[PDB]
Amino acid sequence: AFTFAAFCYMLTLVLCASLIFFVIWHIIAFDELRTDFKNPIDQGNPARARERLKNIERICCLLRKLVVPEYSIHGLFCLMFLCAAEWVTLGLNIPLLFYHLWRYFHRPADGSEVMYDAVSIMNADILNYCQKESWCKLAFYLLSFFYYLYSMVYTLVS
């Protein structure tokens, strides 16, 4: 009983795998950043002082790059389920799409233009908030992946 919606589910599962990997790399980067920031050895050390700045710049640039693929791919999921005539899953996915739009466009805190500028991204509140958000996002992506698998099998067998 192959159907357009079933293929959408298969493709969405394939891409949710990569989304999961992106979020995992994000949480790993933030764990490393937190461990380094809590470590003041780089602070107040004439040697390797530039090392901390270089690491911060590297991480901020890398996660500045990793963000657009995730957001655009989730938007692709939303569009696909819109055209698939799937209403439950699209409703479940729109809130996170709006969250991503808000994150990318709001520009709060009167800070720098970029999301991770490595200058205002050193506030402990920022790290805590984003680590919690990333963990919640990972949990949601796992749940969505399993839901996609279950829906795919259910639609296909039907």
């Binding site: 293929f7 493709l11 394939v14 891409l15 791919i73 692709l76």
Partner: protein, 87 residues
């Protein structure tokens, strides 16, 4: 468009999207360029049998290219056949 039911056309569109996305991810985060724009260009060119100036150089992009070529071959050979009748 009659030779193929609209379900197949929608699946074709979203497969053309998915393959290009996959190729973008594979090349960007596992390199030896292939952005998203050139990736879509390559996928479209391969769907229409007109090759492009760029070919994947890694194994992980070449697998995608191969399956895309097989898929487009099958689909075009299915569509082309019995196309004057529907016109």
């Amino acid at each position: 468009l009659d030779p193929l039911a609209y379900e197949i056309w929608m699946c074709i569109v979203f497969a053309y999207i998915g393959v290009s996305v996959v190729l973008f991810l594979v090349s960007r985060f596992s390199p030896y360029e292939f952005g998203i724009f050139n990736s879509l260009w390559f996928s479209l060119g391969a769907f229409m049998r007109q090759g492009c100036d760029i070919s994947p150089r890694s194994l992980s992009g070449r697998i995608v290219g191969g399956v895309w070529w097989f898929f487009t071959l099958i689909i075009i050979s299915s569509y082309t056949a019995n196309l004057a009748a529907f016109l």
